[PDB]
Amino acid sequence: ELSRVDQRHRASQLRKQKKEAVLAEKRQLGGKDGPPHQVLVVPLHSRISLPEAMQLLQDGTVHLNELGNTQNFMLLCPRLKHRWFFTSARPGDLHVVLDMAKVADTILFLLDPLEGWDSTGDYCLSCLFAQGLPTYTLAVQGISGLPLKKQIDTRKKLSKAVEKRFPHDKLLLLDTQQEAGMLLRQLANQKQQHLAFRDRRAYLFAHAVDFVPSEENNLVGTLKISGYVRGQTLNVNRLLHIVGYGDFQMKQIDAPGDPFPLNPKVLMKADPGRQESLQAEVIPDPDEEAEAKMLEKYKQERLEEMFPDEVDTPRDVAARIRFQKYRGLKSFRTSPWDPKENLPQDYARIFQFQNFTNTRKSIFKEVEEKEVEGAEVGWYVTLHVSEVPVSVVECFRQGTPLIAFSLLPHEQKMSVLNMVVRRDPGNTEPVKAKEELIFHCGFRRFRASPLFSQHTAADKHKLQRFLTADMALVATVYAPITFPPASVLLFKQKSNGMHSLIATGHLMSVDPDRMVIKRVVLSGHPFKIFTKMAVVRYMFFNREDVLWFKPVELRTKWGRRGHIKEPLGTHGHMKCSFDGKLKSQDTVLMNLYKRVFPKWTYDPYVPEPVPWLKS
RNA sequence: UACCUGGUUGAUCCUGCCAGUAGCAUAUGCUUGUCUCAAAGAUUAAGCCAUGCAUGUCUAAGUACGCACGGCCGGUACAGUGAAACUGCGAAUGGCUCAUUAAAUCAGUUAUGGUUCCUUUGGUCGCUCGUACUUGGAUAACUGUGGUAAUUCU
RNA sequence: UGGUGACUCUAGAUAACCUCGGGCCGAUCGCACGCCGGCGGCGACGACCCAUUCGAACGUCUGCCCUAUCAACUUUCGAUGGUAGUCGCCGUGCCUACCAUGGUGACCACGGGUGACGGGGAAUCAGGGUUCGAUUCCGGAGAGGGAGCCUGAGAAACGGCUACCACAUCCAAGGAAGGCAGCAGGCGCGCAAAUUACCCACUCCCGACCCGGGGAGGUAGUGACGAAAAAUAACAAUACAGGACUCUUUCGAGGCCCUGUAAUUGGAAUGAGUCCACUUUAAAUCCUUUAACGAGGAUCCAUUGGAGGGCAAGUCUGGUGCCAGCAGCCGCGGUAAUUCCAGCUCCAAUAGCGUAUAUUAAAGUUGCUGCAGUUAAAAAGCUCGUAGUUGGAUCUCUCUCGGCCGAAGCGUUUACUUUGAAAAAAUUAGAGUGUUCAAAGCAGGCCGCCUGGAUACCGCAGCUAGGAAUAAUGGAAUAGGACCGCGGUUCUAUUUUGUUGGUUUUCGGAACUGAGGCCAUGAUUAAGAGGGACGGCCGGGGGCAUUCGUAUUGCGCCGCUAGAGGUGAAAUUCUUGGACCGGCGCAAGACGGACCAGAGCGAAAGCAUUUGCCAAGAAUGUUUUCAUUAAUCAAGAACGAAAGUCACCAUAAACGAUGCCGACCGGCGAUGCGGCGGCGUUAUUCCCAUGACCCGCCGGGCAGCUUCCGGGAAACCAAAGUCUUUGGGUUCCGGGGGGAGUAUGGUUGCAAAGCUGAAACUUAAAGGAAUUGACGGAAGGGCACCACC
RNA sequence: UACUACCGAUUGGAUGGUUUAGUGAGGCCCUCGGAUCGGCCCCGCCGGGGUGCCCUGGCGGAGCGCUGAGAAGACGGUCGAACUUGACUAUCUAGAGGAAGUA
């Protein structure tokens, strides 16, 4: 500004701008216009009495809501001028913890002073990291019931204990109501974390759920649920999705009075049929037995670790018959494969994009930057939905949370979703490439069977039969389309619903065009050896199948590549030219490849799990 | 400990910089057993501030009619200890920060014979030629009636 | 009366005044009790004034970073000063009234910037320096921004008040309250920084006070900012186809001494820990002291960076194949990678070690010490010329008193030098002292004593006293000079007349004027510094006038006849409307060949026919004159090739690619000018006198040759020397290559242009001398019937 | 295929700094003002004392009596934050268009 007064003036203008921005970010929450501050509470150990946490945290004015088992409630205090909403959950109840941690804004962990955290606490913590965290806070309990010499150092011991998991996070004390007030002041004034999945999409909670039946004998009626809008500006036309119970249309919004505002019934919008979202997922015109199975799985993965894709030679059936749909590639990287070569009936039921990042950035700029005049954020709205069963209301009366989010355009349809995942080092049990896994893919809950393929950059990808202990594998399956970014979780049912955390990753670009190709490798021992040429037995046992396998390539384990010349024996006895020299201990191998596709096994039901234990 | 070394050419000698070298300060990375001392929201934002605390004070010796407690011994003005309140003093020191400020601030040197100064210390305090063996009206604390959604309001 | 260096001071004397918003001159309280109804002893609280203490406030002198792309500012509306006031605690344009027109500035005013609070201090350091100082001591300022106040000894106070501006809280909507740049704490901001802990026990502060209070302060917590100490093993016995030592020719022999990459054997010693107790402390913790436990792969496990060079340490092994990557720089990597990715081994520092950025040394690459400018970056076109800077020799202590010394003067005035006193502590240097050593601390040491708690440094400016070389400055040249006595004019000290009254002089002191005596009466020399005269010369120096010469162009005439021109070649152009040619005559603008020189002159551009006029000038000669007048030069000015423009323009390989002035340092022969001598030739018939030659000498000049003077990177240079053995005076100017002499601003010019003049960004070289080769359609030589004749 | 930065109209809007002109919160000073509160008088009802009179003693009443104290408020002056309109200047932001280089 080239003057000492104008430089100070310019710096004060910039400080005024930046302060306006920061105050506009910190105005959205817990005040006179914003939604309540939602604090999920989890004790990470068994010894931690959560009633002792709630009876300390209660004082403000307690507006005690209640469910069938939990004591979740709204705490209100205009001394701090802040309106909270305290919710509680049990460590291991996955269908509650991971399903309302995705709507809460603060997670309050509790930790005993002696042990860091329980094994079940480590389990739910390892789920919650991969699920996506809001701003969390740590607290202890047993420093007050401890001699004062030990309170000097138990703080230090737990600080070095949790540094593996939370590397820079102070601990607090929750023992007195002054300490609880200091904790609430910590929660109220703290810089937030913005989960972009929750930030770019509109989502809600339900505080007052009412069910009215259209037909009681149909067991499908109308829910009158009530909650504060926490995402974007709500629209009645977009699709609604209760998270564990599929998606269906929503018909009517109205704005009643707030139950408990910080300072002490009209209809807004309806939906004509042209404005409403279409309900078309697909194109309309298209004891010792299981123990022996897991031992066979053990011997299979121990077979598939020193051998890539070895299989026994089919002697009863000709090799051109059992491998009718294969081919031998010169190179997986260079020799291509046509996408319009093999197409099943499932591809005539899925939708596709002319360009994916174009429609992604346009729906980003059309929902984020643009202002629609629907139901605004922070409003205590009451939701009239079109059709909904009664079992959701029964599980509401039990104590399960009910959240819902507004779908975007091109988010109810069908495509082939992609996600790069990795293996959890907690459960080391292997898993085949075609089994069924529980999906937690961007607020959703279903089950399907993907294809576990490798993580490379080429269009062609080699299928893997199992999972790797360190390397990042990719799954590929038909699923309802949901735009990136979204954290994904894949579980398996160990026993009675005790879900096994095995696959923790994120979602990659959904496209049905990334091709996965399954190889098959056959074996045979060479037993007549000459210079740069040999004759192998046990490779095949017919003769014309080799004439069907003329242009395929051959290789040995020691890099000796080659191809056949002429099968001189009526069995698999070939003249085999090679670019190098063959050894008697070596074994020649070919690779025959085919492109695979997953199967249609999406079911929206997930079993309500038993709480997980350390067996 | 008054010090140089690599790099222009086919090879040479130069000019000349670039890079290396050592300390010192702020940050940051990885690592960390013992013990002594020890800096620490200056740099950007002399930006904004929940809550608590940071300044009060009585001796034999200004004013005690609070039974607040005891207590003479009981006509016995006031035994005593004493909250409150009036009075007096302190709150202009300390603590923090470095925005402003360029003969300004500040440093050394001089001066007030050109000023003011609570306190301390010493001097002075029948030096004046003109009801007193004691003067007058109030007001707090206290008692009692209240107002205001709300204040260390009244 | 008393004092000061100095009063319009202090004290005294007189005449009054003495503010109702009044000045002091005691209507106050405790303790011990009393002596002969009176007279009382200690205190406490007061109180005008004076002094003191703690200050404060206004002044004095010297001192500060960058900027001229800030050169004039200040003065209307106080700027500088005078007079009288007003206001103030007082001095003052502090304010008012009336006057004066001042005050500051290239010795940098005014304006702007500062990632500026100032010092004490800090880091680095041969010496000199450079950078930092928000930060615990001192001084200032400010409590969101400005402003105004009350109370008070003291505040323009903010943990006081009143507004406005900006924010912001409670509300029943009427109103009410606010100020963390105190301690914590939060948000924000960011690369960047700790506990909403305990206590008045220590140090001190405040209060009516031995008693109360203190986020001042102390104590813990977090704390790899940083500084000090210091573990991660020691030893013995075995064994080594170790090593060295004594004998053996050698083998090989030794309690001879050391070593190990021996998970060889062995018990010995300990802290880290765990943990009673004491001690510590306000209470605790920590440390120190002690129980008991606590080590063999003593797994009670040391890390961070490297291994081509710089630079200590592997062209070992596998993977990779100009990819991935490494590499501050040079570089490594393209299928054998000493450099990537790993293993193994090795190196350095070690409870620490990498990286980024600021900064210092290295940097004699900012140069005062101490650099550079021919060719590497660079010296102005030339002369004049203000400030600034620098400047030749020369000159060997006394007067009245107070006790033979001091008080009274200094001696022209400074700089310089040495001394003294005055200069906060801390920090730094440094003395003493076994914190168990050390960084520290200021304590400690003997058997109540004994002893510390030093000292130095503290630039510059200002005080004091000695010195008197160096360097400035003064004093007598119209004598208004000194030292003397004598004289005259005016005023005056107060001693003088037993006292008083008055006159009067003297004495003594000033201020002014006349004559006389006296002094060796008084001017340093005349620079191988500089001006200026004079003398005879000299020159393409300049201006004006004048004179000649050929050539060219055009014209007049005559003769001749078809070509004339230009190139490697034509091309272009004029001719029987007789071109070109040859001869004769006329005019016009010019221009001055050869003679013309490694000659001359001029400040530089530059200057050539004869003659005359005008005004200059160098050198030489001088026993002339003045007597430091000088050198270099910002600012400022005069002339300035050639191109360009309506007189301007002021620019060049403007080139010796080379500031100016001064001294010293080798030879040799020519030349130009002037002067001095000398055999002998010529000319003026002799004779001198001169001219032309010849042999020298002297002085400046233009040049050249030469050289182990000494330089220099060398080419080269008698200056480009007298340079690490570095200082004669002074000007301009350079700081790796580009961007770029570009953009913008200012300024001059009609304009072209002139002067001034960056940054972003890019880059590891660009560049100079010299040496070996390579080349040709450059020029010279030698040679071969696998060349020619 | 995209960036970069300029002009940039909008005299966008907003904010800051110098000044012209106009306005002027609040305190302080001055000239007034006088809501209220006292005292001294003048009587009435009247004791004691001295002697119908005076001093005390209690009231009560009124008098524009005559004085003391005195708040709100207002004229003026001063200091003076701030406000408005200009002019100049600076910055932050919304902004069409484009160009060149950047690769």
Nearest nucleotide relative to A22: CA against C1': C188
* Approach to solving: cryo-EM
Measure, in angstroms, how far nucleotide D32 C1' is from residue A518 CA. Answer: 112
Chain B: positions less than 7 Å from a protein CB are 44-45, 47, 50, 100-101
Residue A220 phi, psi dihedral angles, 5° rounding: -135, 120
Measure, in angstroms, how far nucleotide C569 C1' is from residue A196 CA. Answer: 88
Q: How many CA atoms lie within 13 A of A101 on its CB side?
A: 28
Measure, in angstroms, how far nucleotide C753 C1' is from residue A6 CA. Answer: 39
A601: exposed, middle or buried (Cβ count in 10 Å: 0-12, 13-18, 19+): middle
Task: Decide: CB of A16 under 7 A of nucleic strand C.
Answer: no
Measure, in angstroms, how far nucleotide D47 C1' is from residue A97 CA. Answer: 103
Element (H, E) at A416: strand A414-423
Measure, in angstroms, how far nucleotide C708 C1' is from residue A463 CA. Answer: 91
Q: How far apart are CA A220 and CA A213, in angstroms?
A: 6
Measure, in angstroms, how far nucleotide D5 C1' is from residue A200 CA. Answer: 34
Is A442 in contact with A488 (CB distance < 8 Å)? yes
Footprint of strand D on the protein (CB under 7 A): A 1-3, 5-6, 9-10, 13-14, 17
- DSSP assignment of A342-384 equals ---GGGGS----S-HHHHHHHHHHHHSSS---SBPTT-EEEEE
Q: How far apart are CA A478 and CA A350, in angstroms?
A: 8
Task: Decide: CB of A79 under 7 A of nucleic strand C.
Answer: no
Who contacts A29 (Cβ-Cβ below 8 Å, separation ≥6)? A35, A37, A105, A192
Name the 3-class secondary structure at A309: coil
Measure, in angstroms, how far nucleotide C439 C1' is from residue A405 CA. Answer: 67
Task: Decide: CB of A22 under 7 A of nucleic strand C.
Answer: yes
Task: Decide: CB of A164 under 7 A of nucleic strand C.
Answer: no
Nearest nucleotide relative to A6: CA against C1': D90
End-to-end CA distance of chain A: 70
Measure, in angstroms, how far nucleotide C355 C1' is from residue A162 CA. Answer: 29
Name the 3-class secondary structure at A306: coil
Measure, in angstroms, how far nucleotide C5 C1' is from residue A44 CA. Answer: 94
Q: How far apart are CA A456 and CA A471, in angstroms?
A: 12
Amino acid, single-letter form, for residue A228: Y
Task: Decide: CB of A182 under 7 A of nucleic strand C.
Answer: yes
Measure, in angstroms, how far nucleotide B81 C1' is from residue A151 CA. Answer: 46
Q: How far is CA A401 from CA A223, A415, A489, in A?
A: 14, 29, 19
A282: exposed, middle or buried (Cβ count in 10 Å: 0-12, 13-18, 19+): middle
Measure, in angstroms, how far nucleotide C441 C1' is from residue A152 CA. Answer: 32
For helices A50-57 and A177-188, angle between their N-to-C axes, nearest 10 degrees:
80
Nearest nucleotide relative to A4: CA against C1': C113
Residue A546 phi, psi dihedral angles, 5° rounding: -70, -35
Q: Name the resolution in angstroms.
A: 3.0
Say if strands A250-255 and A220-228 run parallel, antiparallel, or are unpaired.
unpaired
Chain D: positions less than 7 Å from a protein CB are 15-17, 90-93
Chain A 183-222, CB < 7 Å to strand C:
185, 189-191
